[PDB]
Design a protein around this ligand. Sequence first.
Ligand SMILES: *[C@H](O)[C@H](C[C@@H]1CCNC1=O)NC(=O)[C@H](CC1CCCCC1)NC(=O)[C@@H](NC(=O)OCC1CC1)[C@@H](C)OC(C)(C)C
Ligand SMILES: *[C@H](O)[C@H](C[C@@H]1CCNC1=O)NC(=O)[C@H](CC1CCCCC1)NC(=O)[C@@H](NC(=O)OCC1CC1)[C@@H](C)OC(C)(C)C
Lengths: 306, 306
Amino acid sequence: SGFRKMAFPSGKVEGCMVQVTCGTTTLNGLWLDDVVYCPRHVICTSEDMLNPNYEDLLIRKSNHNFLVQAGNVQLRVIGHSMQNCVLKLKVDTANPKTPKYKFVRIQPGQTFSVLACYNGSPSGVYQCAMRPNFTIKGSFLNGSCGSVGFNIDYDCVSFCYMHHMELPTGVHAGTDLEGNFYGPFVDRQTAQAAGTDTTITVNVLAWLYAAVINGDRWFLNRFTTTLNDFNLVAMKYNYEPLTQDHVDILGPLSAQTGIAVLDMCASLKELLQNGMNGRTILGSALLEDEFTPFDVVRQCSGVTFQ
Amino acid sequence: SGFRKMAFPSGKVEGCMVQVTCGTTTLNGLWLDDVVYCPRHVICTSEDMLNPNYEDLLIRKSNHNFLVQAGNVQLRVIGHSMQNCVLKLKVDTANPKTPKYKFVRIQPGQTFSVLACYNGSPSGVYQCAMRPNFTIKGSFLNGSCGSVGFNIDYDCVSFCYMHHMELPTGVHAGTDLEGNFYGPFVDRQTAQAAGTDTTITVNVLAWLYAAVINGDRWFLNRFTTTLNDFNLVAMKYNYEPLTQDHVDILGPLSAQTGIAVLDMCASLKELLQNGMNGRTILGSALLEDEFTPFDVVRQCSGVTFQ
Ligand SMILES: *[C@H](O)[C@H](C[C@@H]1CCNC1=O)NC(=O)[C@H](CC1CCCCC1)NC(=O)[C@@H](NC(=O)OCC1CC1)[C@@H](C)OC(C)(C)C
Ligand SMILES: *[C@H](O)[C@H](C[C@@H]1CCNC1=O)NC(=O)[C@H](CC1CCCCC1)NC(=O)[C@@H](NC(=O)OCC1CC1)[C@@H](C)OC(C)(C)C
């Protein structure tokens, strides 16, 4: 019993965090094998923030401009290359702590654990979702750039996020580990705003299944709904459209609880139209949308990682 | 910016989790130096659950009854001793991954990270508080016993919780690492209930400071309040009494935000009496009480761990 925003165990990633200093900029890098990945705006200065030509900026760099600290051991950069918005610093030492890992570009709606770091030292771990507007509602201060988001699958760390910047609304934007921003954002200080976000409907439904698995039933009802009539209601309340693929993905949870997906949709419909009327679901007074169907099954069933 | 329920990085603890099997019972143990700590009800069977004499049960055990798996390496038990409700299995191998660590018995209201584990394999990490009624609102399934809760201070893991049991309300009860239950609970299957819980007032106030640090101000007001008149209101809404010591602890947050503690109390008073009126604080529609003042300062300022 119980349901918590659960992050993956972070140790496999902690072992990869390093400090990258270039000029007056310090941020975090991800040390996998003999490469340190970090946001390319590490090669920018206080005047370089605005409209930088990173190819120009980078050819003016030498390897010894890049100060990579792995704890209390200075790593020597022997080469560098820029891939989209990530800098790849080739170092002379392979990280002996390199986990089995993949780089994955996730879809919006997908969740991940963020290992927040400063000066290459992990500070905290929390679960985020990639919002539909490709921002993440993170917790990031100055120096957190290069902190990564990740999922773990048995023994394999799937890195999916590297932190680059905070938008004026206080949400966060970054890239996959191959340096491609999530969303329309660019790594240059110009007018950029998040764009209107929407609620991740399939995740809300998953969490409603989590609630039923855990003994909250007060929100269930007799009614059912069609996928279209649900989506017409979702529509109004700024909810992401629910697709048939979403429905299928919610299959196991529907099968475990005996609640047809569209029945749960009928329940969410009435939740959207009636509020919760002073009640809570899984300790929340809001409809929670940062658990995927996978998240619910993993935590309500006990999947682990070796 | 941003504010998240942040757990500590779990790697230092992941390196200590092991599987302890005795008879038909498998649970987790905590391997520090050459000792494996685990709940003593590992020596119980399906009929032994009810009113066991653990001293009786334990003298009937031999060391080879204890099967300790550290990943894929069998640890040999060379001795065992029971300390309150924890079993200490002496093994012939010191954990090379043993962090700097302390055992600490925390006060209610204090938070910690739980590294949820099954079969000695970490499954997830989340932040909990010790509730005023000495339960924790955890996320725990069969086999999670022996999962530990912890805080990290620079390099030192302060273990404060070991998981033992779920109560009928779905909340969780366990011990400190010296085997002393938090609360009135005992490790034997009898009528035990959590006892009425209360909201951790000083933590709610801390989180209100977190909100102001992060730019939510809608709940602040002109008014102030006396500590007594606040506590008379807290009283009604099942809030833990706020002490002067609590006030002092909220000092730095008051100093950082320029909001006197009792002014923030006046704000919480009106939140308790007016609800939030369809508004949210730090993405919550409830008053959140599982951030300590320390938690807020750490995350709003960036404290890390080497
Ligand atoms: C890296 O450690 C740091 C992390 C952020 C600081 C505060 N919280 C964070 O997540 N990232 C930055 O400081 C970047 C700097 C680079 C400069 C080169 C271009 C990419 C960003 N900047 C920010 O995140 C600022 N955001 C910003 O400038 O946005 C302007 C519009 C382009 C989006 C932050 C620090 O400024 C504000 C807090 C938004 C005022
Ligand atoms: C250990 O892995 C396991 C973890 C719990 C299982 C479900 N969630 C958990 O946190 N712990 C147990 O199964 C203990 C077994 C020992 C037996 C010897 C005495 C101490 C507990 N039991 C429970 O947590 C049960 N709770 C219980 O029996 O409470 C009865 C009153 C004494 C409190 C759970 C499994 O049963 C219910 C879910 C409450 C029905």
